[PDB]
Design a binder for this molecule. Structure first.
Ligand SMILES: Nc1nc2c(ncn2[C@@H]2O[C@H](COP(=O)(O)OP(=O)(O)OP(=O)(O)O)[C@@H](O)[C@H]2O)c(=O)[nH]1
Ligand SMILES: [Mg+2]
Ligand SMILES: [Mg+2]
Lengths: 62, 273, 135, 233, 51, 388, 102
RNA sequence: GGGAUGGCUUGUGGCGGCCAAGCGUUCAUAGCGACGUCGCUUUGAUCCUUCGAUGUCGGCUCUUCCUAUCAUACCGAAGCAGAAUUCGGUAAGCGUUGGAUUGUACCCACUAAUAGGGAACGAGCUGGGUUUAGACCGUCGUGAGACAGGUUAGUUUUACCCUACUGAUGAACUCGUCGCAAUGGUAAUUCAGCUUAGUACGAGAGGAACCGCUGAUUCAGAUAAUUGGUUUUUGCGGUUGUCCGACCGGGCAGUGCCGCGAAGCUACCAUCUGCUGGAUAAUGGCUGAACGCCUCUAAGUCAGAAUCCAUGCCAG
RNA sequence: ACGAGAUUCCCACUGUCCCUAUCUACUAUCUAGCGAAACCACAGCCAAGGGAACGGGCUUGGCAAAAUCAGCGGGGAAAGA
RNA sequence: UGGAAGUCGGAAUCCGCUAAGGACUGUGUAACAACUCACCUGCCGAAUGUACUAGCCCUGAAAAUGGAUGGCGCUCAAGCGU
């Protein structure tokens, strides 16, 4: 019997993933993303535009 | 095929046999009077004729009390055409042919007087009477004797005289492509308890034994076949299982044990001249 | 072909090696002592076992003397161990019984006494054609 | 299919379109493959390959020598009836290795206690037990000569006729290591044996058939499984 | 089936050859259980007169 | 000398050590890989295992033996109250691995998620996130804007913080469960905007998972305590009256080294292990608001997923629930992590459509053969207490 | 070694047709194609080599029962294997003939 | 009182005679000798030639390693049409079974296959070698007794110590929540059926394979909806003897006994699940020198095994 | 006939086994009290080498983090050995 | 020899034209045919071929816990010869 880690079995699984299960997963993911988007939609220093510093070691201390 | 029918052909047994042959000067080949050509080891005869011709082979026809006297005399004639033969009933209390066998061994000792002693080894099938012949010649139960095969498993020296030694040997069965398990069981190679489906050999017993002998022995008559014979014997003797079922297997084992132990009279007739 | 029925779903194996089951056909045998199961794998100390519809190697312990010296292929048609089918039904028969067939699946006998299993009837077409009741 | 069907298929359809080219390329790569096998094979496969290549090289150079020379004895002259022909009455092997008594005999222990009795000696080398031999009773046999180590014939070769015949043995005349070994009939290297030479047609000056002649064992029977001898003619 | 996947992939339509009075009842889900009872046990052509 | 009869190993070396899990909630070791051209979506959720029940499925599996037939299958019910997103964690890539850079929390956090930060909530002053809630007010959330822009600029992996609404469950636990759920798809700015729009909002299970999809269940198994080798590793029992025990291994060693190896079966802890089981099909995502969410299009009985007398040792499922084909690791009342499959599926079983015809709602407290109280009353009739 | 030799020799013997059991048309067709004397001599030499290999193995196993050192055991094993190799090498022509026959 | 050969070994015989590349040898022309060869060691037979335990091996449970590969994966060759194979190569990832026979190691069947060894054989348990004291027979001895031997019955009985292993806590850095992943382990395996297809192939008998689909064997990890099992639920009922005067309600017979029995635990006796990228070995090549032909190799490079390394997975 | 003598088989019978699962009591466990002994040069992680086919200490490496609890029988230790 | 034309076999293997060509080195045919090799000529352009000797390197046989030029590591050496 061909192994699970066999090159031809892997190629067959890759073709299955590309051609058959791929569109189904894409359509399901698009529907779920739309449903979650429904719930989701339903100076620089003083304004946060300039990302400043927050308010052993890599080098030898010297 | 079961290994119980392969019993008697072991390498240990045949190493014992060739040890006895190499140690012995005179080979007493013991034959059953009920089947003399059936119990004859032409394998060993060929080996002795080819490789060790100096050793003297003597036929001893034992168990002549289980055959008619005229048939026994005819078998003695047929065997004495080939080799020097003796007739024997191997019993400690009531032996027959013991004096003749002693005289024959004395003659062989006179021939081999130059050696300090001679060794006489006994060969044959299981349950032909080798250890019983040794006991009858000795006058004392010096070798273990039982009606089931294979009691003698090793070689044993017993001194008959200061110049004659007797060697016991385990029973040997030469391999043959024509021998059947039924033939081996009827010759007495195997034990009856260890074999499977015992009632297939009962028709062979009914062929070898006259019907009136069965009727007189078991006090039953009117059976049409071996199955009905065993069923009637079981119902008469009370060999019943749970649920009133007759014990045909146990009854067949009883009849086979009787057949090999000589409670049922049978013999092989000698060929006509 | 080594006599392994293909397409059989997993069921509880109730008849191991050494079991004596009834002979459901008219071939002359009345019981079958199982000595091997066709398609049995390799496992330490595990006895081979068979279920309904499984092909086994058997010997006859009671019946006609002609069948007593050979090793016959058999198909198990009834078992007493409860087993589940795909519809969730747990079921069992009142006895363990099988039939004698050739290695290709055709029966030696000509009729079957009592019902047969659905698995045996589906897997061996001659059992379905020679059965009177199918359960 | 019947008869020469693959040949008929090759006649009616041919072969693969690249078959000749791939055969030529494989025959061209054969030298690189042979060198790669000579430099990269390992173990017993490598040893067998090297021996086989050595045999091929010897056969090849012999072929070259024969094709190159396609177009091309005693010291003293003697007549044709004196050709192929050859005091001190020495045997071919006047001296062998002496054999100790442990190398001859091992100790057979007997008894039933933890301390056994070791008076029985078994002969380890092959023996000739003699004619009409019957084993002694077990209580009185000291020197065990086992049945599987008994030999009755020997491959005896004639030095002048250059032929080897399997001859029966009559007796053991001298085992050089020990007279006890001769008495036991032990067949070792350099042992003088007596053989039946009736099959060689040896005759005396008047017509009597000579059927007994000395020969000497030239091999090691305990290591070779056979007795090889040279006639003392 | 060879145009639509092959053997073991094509799903057969067992309700395609149904003969009914009204064609759009072909793919209806027939009820079987209602309040712990069997609908097919209560199916009767004279059920109106019986009621 | 060698072993005379070959036999494989008892147990697997891939699940060592056989110790108790480091924490009760299952850990998502790996998330599905991110494809930026995909839409933004969540990849995990949590629930609580209620129990199991029985279904009848109208199977459409071409080439199978039970094709166009009815099959009885076991399913597991997971109660899934809606989850609340209360945070956003940013991850950067370093040569030492993924590193958490910043974490932005919501302005208002519930007492459920606040109980997780305390071991004694009843004695506490409940001061958690009180000074953090003021940075939404001071300088118009300038610090929050800075951290969000830091996630947008420097991070490659964005995860939301989501906690369960445990008050909706029959559990006596008031302390909620909180986890990081990775956002997959889109760009990093899209993920940050997606989380910012999802702060303080309830997220239901039907917007993360969809019916007839295979998912993975991550949980901690049933604990068994200290268990000997016979049940811990499946070893053969020694014969009767074996000296110093028969439920043991006769030889823990006969060969060099002069040690006990790590491959020898020894007595110890069994169960309470962290397990991730894969390829579990979702059969039904039932709604809590529906009063007939355990009613199929064939079985017209109006009934809910709760059996009569409730689930044993759990209670009643009154929220959205997930029906999963088969069995999942864990016990009743236990937190369950449902995760998207890491790879595109390679089986037709993941492409099958499940059509249920009947769901068992009989009592699991005995041999219940009625699916509702009305059926039991109709079968029995009138009792003594009804007249009383 | 002797088991391998006996298995291969028995496979050679038991697979080739036996002329004494064939139909007279098949037997005489094999006689026309092949000298039946040569066919029977080749198969008889195969059987003779098989039985000689078995006899040599039996004798050398019996000698190895009494061999007293690893050197003597090694020499006996090499002697038995060399005798078997000599017996097989003396079958150079019948093996080629029987392969062509096959 | 004293003790308790080893960088061995493996696949190809010995003896005797020829032949011969070569080594030696030119004041002696001898002597060794690779590759070979020749003699000794039944027309498919016979089954009427089994040839000496002083040296001891087996078995249960369980783990790991080696390759000297039985099967599975890939490849080369063969009258290899197909099917089934045979020989050889890379490969230890993964398996390699159930029984009979003790008057003393081979048979039978299933299976893909029933491969070979090491870690002992240079104080775990249990059957023989094997042997304290009892007893019998056989041989030997005048005898006590011994043995060529055969038979029967027969006393060693830790763990709480250190280390190793399997699990479980834990000080110091305020407590807690959410994480990363260095390193260690790592897992799947084989067969069958449907379609291809009664097609390629074939005189006929027969009879494949790739893609696709569905199950099953062994292994592993879980789980209790269902079905069996389990009952101190002493939950309910029945029943024997005795005792509380009888009924009721109870005690005792260490759980009196029996029937059913939820819950819990459980079972291939039940159910569920077991996943993908890169680099390679043998080989098959491309371009192209060495070497004016040629060449898969030298520079460069493509593919390719169940192999290797990682992800998935477990610990942290 | 008799036998706690040795052996083989048949029926019945069953967890001897396939193949293990579950329950009860007393332990083991924890606590209060009480409380030894065997044994002990010093000590206790491995790999290779250490001619006297011995190594726990030496050489060269792997490495190596307090204090502990329940089991466990590989090693050490342990048999009036 | 049914067929055998150099090429299934056995034995001989010569002469002529020659620049050179075997009573033929292989492929091929039922046999022929055809191709090819040995050999020769034309183009080219200057060094090659064979067999040995001496160095270094590969193979020249290996089992079974994980390990050893002492360890790292070393390639116009941190290897070898002076
Ligand atoms: N009627 C009769 N029976 C005899 C005679 N001799 C022996 N038997 C029976 O045959 C049986 C065989 O006796 P054994 O002495 O053991 O003969 P065996 O051939 O040595 O048997 P094995 O021990 O198997 O070798 C005995 O039990 C006797 O009863 C005889 O002369 N007459
Ligand atoms: Mg007897
Ligand atoms: Mg006897």
């Amino acid at each position: 019997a061909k192994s699970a880690r066999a090159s031809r079995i892997k190629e067959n699984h890759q073709r299955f993933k590309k051609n058959i299960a791929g569109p189904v997963e894409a359509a399901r993911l698009e529907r779920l993303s739309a449903k979650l988007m429904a719930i989701a939609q339903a100076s620089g220093v003083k304004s946060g535009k300039s990302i400043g510093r927050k308010d052993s070691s890599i080098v030898f201390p010297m | 095929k079961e290994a119980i029918f392969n019993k008697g052909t072991s390498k240990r047994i045949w190493n014992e046999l060739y040890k006895v042959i190499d140690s012995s000067d005179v080979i007493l080949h013991v034959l059953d009077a009920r089947d003399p050509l059936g119990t004859r080891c032409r394998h060993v005869e060929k080996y002795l004729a080819a490789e060790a011709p100096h050793k003297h082979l003597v036929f001893v026809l034992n168990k002549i009390d289980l055959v008619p006297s005229s048939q026994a005399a005819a078998w003695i004639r047929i065997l004495q055409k080939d080799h020097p033969t003796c007739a024997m009933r191997a019993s400690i209390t009531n032996p027959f042919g013991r004096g003749s066998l002693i005289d024959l061994l004395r003659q062989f000792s006179v021939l081999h007087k130059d050696r300090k002693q001679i060794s006489v080894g006994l060969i044959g099938y299981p349950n032909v009477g080798k250890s019983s012949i040794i006991n009858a010649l000795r006058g004392k139960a010096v070798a273990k004797v039982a009606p089931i095969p294979g009691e003698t498993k090793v070689w044993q020296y017993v001194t008959l005289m200061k110049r004659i030694y007797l060697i016991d040997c385990p029973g040997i069965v030469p391999p043959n492509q024509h021998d059947t398990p039924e033939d081996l069981l009827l010759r007495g190679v195997v034990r009856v308890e260890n074999v499977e489906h015992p009632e297939q050999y009962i028709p062979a017993v009914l062929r070898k034994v006259k019907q009136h002998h069965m009727e007189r022995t078991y006090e039953l008559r009117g059976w049409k076949d071996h199955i009905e014979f065993l069923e009637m014997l079981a119902r008469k003797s009370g060999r019943l299982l749970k649920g009133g079922e007759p014990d045909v297997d146990g009854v067949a084992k009883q009849v086979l044990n009787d057949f090999m132990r000589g409670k049922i009279p049978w013999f092989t007739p000698a060929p006509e001249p | 072909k080594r006599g392994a029925p293909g397409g059989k779903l997993k069921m509880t194996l109730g008849l191991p090696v050494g079991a004596i089951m009834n002979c459901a056909d008219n071939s002359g045998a009345r019981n079958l002592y199982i000595i091997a199961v066709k398609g049995a794998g390799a496992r330490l100390n595990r006895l081979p076992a068979g279920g309904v519809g499984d092909m086994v190697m058997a010997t006859v312990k009671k019946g006609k003397p002609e069948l007593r010296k050979k090793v016959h292929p058999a198909v198990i048609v009834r078992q007493a161990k409860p087993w589940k089918r795909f519809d969730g039904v747990f079921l069992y028969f009142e006895d363990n019984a099988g039939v004698i067939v050739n290695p290709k699946g055709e029966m030696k006998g000509s009729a079957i006494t009592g019902p047969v299993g659905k698995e045996a009837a589906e897997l061996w077409p001659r059992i379905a054609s020679n059965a009177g009741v199918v359960m | 299919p019947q008869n020469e069907y693959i040949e008929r298929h090759r006649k009616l359809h041919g072969r693969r379109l690249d078959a000749e080219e791939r055969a030529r390329k494989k025959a061209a790569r054969e030298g690189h493959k042979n060198s790669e096998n000579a430099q990269n094979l390992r173990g017993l496969r490598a040893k067998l390959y090297a021996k086989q290549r050595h045999a091929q090289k010897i056969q090849m150079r012999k072929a070259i020598k024969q094709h190159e020379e396609r177009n091309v004895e005693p010291s003293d002259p003697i007549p044709s009836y004196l050709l192929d022909r050859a005091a001190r009455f020495s045997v071919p092997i006047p001296k062998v290795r002496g054999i100790s008594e442990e190398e001859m005999f091992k100790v057979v222990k007997t008894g039933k206690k933890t301390h056994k009795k070791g008076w029985k000696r078994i002969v380890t080398k092959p023996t000739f037990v003699g004619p009409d031999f019957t084993r002694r009773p077990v209580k009185y046999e000291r020197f065990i000569r086992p049945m599987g180590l008994r030999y009755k014939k020997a491959n005896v070769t004639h030095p002048t006729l250059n032929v080897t015949v399997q001859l029966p043995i009559l007796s053991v005349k001298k085992n050089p290591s020990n007279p006890l070994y001769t008495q036991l009939g032990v067949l070792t290297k350099g042992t003088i044996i007596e053989v039946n030479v009736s099959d060689l047609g040896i005759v005396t000056a008047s017509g009597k058939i000579a059927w007994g002649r000395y020969a000497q064992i030239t091999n090691n029977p305990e290591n070779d499984g056979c007795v090889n001898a040279v006639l003392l003619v | 089936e060879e145009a639509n996947g092959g053997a073991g992939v094509f799903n057969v339509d067992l309700r395609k050859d149904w003969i009914l009075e009204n064609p759009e009842w072909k793919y209806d889900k027939i009820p079987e259980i209602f309040d712990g009872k069997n609908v097919y046990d209560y199916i009767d052509p004279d059920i109106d007169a019986k009621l | 000398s060698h072993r005379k009869y070959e036999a494989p190993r008892h147990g697997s070396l891939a699940f060592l050590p056989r110790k108790r899990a480091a924490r009760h909630r299952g850990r998502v070791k790996s998330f599905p890989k991110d494809d930026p051209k995909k839409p933004v979506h969540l990849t995990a959720a949590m629930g609580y295992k209620a129990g199991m029940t029985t279904i009848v499925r109208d199977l459409d599996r071409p080439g199978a033996k039970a094709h166009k037939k009815e099959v009885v299958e076991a399913v597991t019910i997971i109660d899934c109250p809606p989850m609340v997103v209360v945070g956003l964690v940013g991850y950067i890539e370093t040569p030492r691995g993924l590193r958490s850079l910043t974490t932005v929390w919501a302005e208002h956090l519930s007492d459920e998620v606040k109980r997780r930060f305390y071991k004694n909530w009843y004695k506490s002053k409940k001061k958690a996130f009180t000074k953090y809630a003021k940075k939404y007010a001071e300088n118009n959330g300038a610090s929050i804007t800075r951290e969000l822009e830091r996630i947008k600029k420097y991070c490659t992996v964005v995860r939301v913080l989501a906690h369960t609404q445990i008050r909706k469950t029959p559990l006596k636990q008031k302390k909620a469960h909180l986890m990081e759920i990775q956002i997959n798809g889109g760009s990093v700015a899209d993920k940050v905007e997606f989380g910012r729009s999802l702060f303080e909002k309830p997220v239901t299970i039907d917007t993360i998972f969809e019916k007839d999809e295979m998912i993975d269940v991550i949980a901690v198994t049933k604990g068994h305590g200290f268990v000997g080798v016979t049940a811990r590793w499946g070893t053969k029992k020694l014969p009767r009256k074996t000296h110093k025990g028969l439920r043991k291994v006769a030889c823990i060693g006969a060969w060099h080294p002069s040690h006990v190896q790590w491959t020898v079966a020894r007595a110890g802890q069994m169960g309470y292990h962290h397990r991730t089981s894969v390829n579990h099909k979702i059969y039904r995502i039932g709604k809590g608001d529906d009063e007939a969410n355990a009613s199929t299009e064939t079985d017209l009985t109006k009934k809910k997923i709760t059996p009569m007398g409730g689930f044993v040792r759990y209670g009643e499922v009154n929220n959205d629930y997930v029906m999963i084909k088969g069995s999942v690791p864990g016990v009743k009342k236990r937190i369950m992590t449902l995760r998207k499959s890491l790879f595109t599926h390679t089986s037709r079983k993941a492409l099958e459509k499940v059509e249920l015809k009947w769901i068992d709602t009989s009592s699991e407290f005995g041999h219940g053969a009625f699916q509702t109280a009305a059926e039991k009353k109709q079968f029995m009739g009138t009792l003594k207490k009804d007249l009383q | 070694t002797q088991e391998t030799c006996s298995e291969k020799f028995g496979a050679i013997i038991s697979s080739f047709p036996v002329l004494s059991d064939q139909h007279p048309f098949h037997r005489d067709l094999m006689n026309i194609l092949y000298d039946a004397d040569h066919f029977k001599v080749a198969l008889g030499q195969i059987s003779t080599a098989k039985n000689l290999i078995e006899t040599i193995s039996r004798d050398y196993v019996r000698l190895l029962k009494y061999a007293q050192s690893l050197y003597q055991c090694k020499q006996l094993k090499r002697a038995a294997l060399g005798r078997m190799a000599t017996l097989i090498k003396r079958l150079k022509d019948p093996l080629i003939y029987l392969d062509q026959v096959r």
